[PDB]
């Protein structure tokens, strides 16, 4: 499913201020990571693949059966992250952001959202 900006903001309300990260941060990250598409996938040079709305990596967070010697920290099949229901992605993201590096785990966030006015991403949305 391809979400709308305000539609996604409402769907990710459980991430608002999670670990000190305001909602605009998550919406900004989703936009630049997947362009709001739950079905987005991208293969990486190391052989791992990124899945879904938040482009969660198979080397650490989920199992896709083709990333040898990887971890499955969120204990889920990577395909579960492609669902129109973003719950699985939201739940796994919470573990990721708690792992020590915060939102820096998302390269697009680090490069395009960090230090910008992320509040603009939820402008006009009735939350
Ligand atoms: C959204 C997404 O999938 N992002 C991926 C990143 O998670 C990944 O970064 C690597 O992540 C692991 C797990 O969080 C990092 O290891 C952790 O490092 C912290 C140090 O602050 C430590 O406290 C944790 O114990 C340790 N986790 C465990 C379970 O061992 C690791 O530092 C990250 N590596 C890099 C190079 O930053 C990157 C790299 O695979 O990919 C993103 O797609």
Swiss-Prot record:
Tissue: In the egg white and polymorphonuclear leukocytes.
Pfam families: Lys
Gene Ontology molecular functions: beta-N-acetylglucosaminidase activity; identical protein binding; lysozyme activity
EC number: 3.2.1.17
Assigned GO CC terms: cytoplasm; endoplasmic reticulum; extracellular space
Identification of the protein by name: Lysozyme C
Record family assignment: Belongs to the glycosyl hydrolase 22 family.
Assembly mode: Monomer.
Compartments (UniProt record): Secreted
Disulfide bonds: 6-125, 28-113, 62-78, 74-92
Keywords from the UniProt entry: Allergen, Antimicrobial, Bacteriolytic enzyme, Disulfide bond, Glycosidase, Hydrolase, Secreted, Signal
Function field: Lysozymes have primarily a bacteriolytic function; those in tissues and body fluids are associated with the monocyte-macrophage system and enhance the activity of immunoagents. Has bacteriolytic activity against M.luteus.
Designated gene of the protein: LYZ
GO biological process, alphabetically ordered: cell wall macromolecule catabolic process; defense response to bacterium; defense response to Gram-negative bacterium; defense response to Gram-positive bacterium; killing of cells of another organism
Boundaries of every C-type lysozyme domain copy: 1-127
InterPro entries, sorted: Glyco_hydro_22, Glyco_hydro_22_CS, Glyco_hydro_22_lys, Lysozyme-like_dom_sf
Species name: Gallus gallus
UniProt lineage: Eukaryota, Metazoa, Chordata, Craniata, Vertebrata
Enzyme class: hydrolase
Residues reported to bind substrate: 99
Gene3D superfamilies: 1.10.530.10
More details: Lysozyme C is capable of both hydrolysis and transglycosylation; it also shows a slight esterase activity. It acts rapidly on both peptide-substituted and unsubstituted peptidoglycan, and slowly on chitin oligosaccharides.
Nucleus among keywords: no
Active site: 33, 50
Reaction equation(s) it catalyzes: Hydrolysis of (1->4)-beta-linkages between N-acetylmuramic acid and N-acetyl-D-glucosamine residues in a peptidoglycan and between N-acetyl-D-glucosamine residues in chitodextrins
Alphabetical list of SUPFAM superfamilies matching this protein: Lysozyme-like
């Amino acid at each position: 499913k391809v979400f709308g900006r305000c539609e996604l903001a409402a769907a990710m309300k459980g991430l608002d201020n999670y670990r000190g990260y305001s909602l605009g941060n998550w919406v900004c990250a989703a936009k630049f990571e997947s362009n709001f598409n739950t079905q987005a996938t991208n293969r990486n040079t190391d052989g791992s693949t990124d899945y879904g709305i938040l482009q969660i990596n198979s080397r650490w967070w989920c199992n896709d059966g083709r990333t040898p010697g990887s971890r499955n920290l969120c204990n889920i099949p990577c395909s579960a992250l492609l669902s129109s229901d973003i719950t699985a992605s939201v739940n796994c993201a919470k573990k990721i952001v708690s792992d020590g590096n915060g939102m820096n785990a998302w390269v697009a966030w680090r490069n395009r959202c960090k230090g910008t006015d992320v509040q603009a991403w939820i402008r006009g949305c009735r939350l």
